[PDB]
Amino acid sequence: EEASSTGRNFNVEKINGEWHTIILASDKREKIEDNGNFRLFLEQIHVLEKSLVLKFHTVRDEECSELSMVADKTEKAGEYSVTYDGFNTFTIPKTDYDNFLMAHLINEKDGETFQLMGLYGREPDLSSDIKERFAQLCEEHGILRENIIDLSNANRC
Ligand SMILES: CCCCCCCCCO
């Protein structure tokens, strides 16, 4: 079964646990390229009453560095916010809890904005079919495939 965080049947406790960044996408590609601040490798999500504790690592010159963030529920169901290189809000438009999680994020920094979409997997990679469903979701948000970067061959330290 699948759900959206904004849906009535969403069960947030079920996204708790291990995750891996499989693909990242953005309508401002530089943000997720090699030295971009948003090329974040998710490791785990800890679900709390009114927040999600997100654990990631970033890479630079082949060197990993850990980073944690706390995302707070906003006033709209299924939406969370977190301060990181500007102000961010995000939702989970689609997840099946056991294999994949697709997130949509809006960043606002210095009066600007951009969209980021992420495909996370319970294992370090996902099937080609789920990767295609992610490309379709990116298309629905006006993000071209050439702005979608598969990081499954670079998500481990
Ligand atoms: C559901 C938790 C993941 C939300 C998306 C975070 C994106 C970070 C920038 O890559």
From Swiss-Prot:
One of its GO terms (biological process) is positive regulation of phosphatidylinositol 3-kinase/protein kinase B signal transduction. GO terms for cellular component: cytosol; extracellular space; nucleus. GO terms for molecular function: insulin receptor activity; pheromone binding; small molecule binding. InterPro entries: Calycin, Lipocalin, Lipocalin_CS, Lipocln_cytosolic_FA-bd_dom, Maj_urinary. Keywords: Disulfide bond, Pheromone-binding, Secreted, Signal, Transport. It holds the Pfam family Lipocalin. Its main location: secreted. Disulfide bonds join 64-157. It is found in: Secreted. Gene3D superfamilies: 2.40.128.20. Abundant in the urine of adult male mice but absent from that of females. The keyword Secreted applies. Belongs to the calycin superfamily. Lipocalin family. Binds pheromones that are released from drying urine of males. These pheromones affect the sexual behavior of females. This is Major urinary protein 2. It comes from Mus musculus.
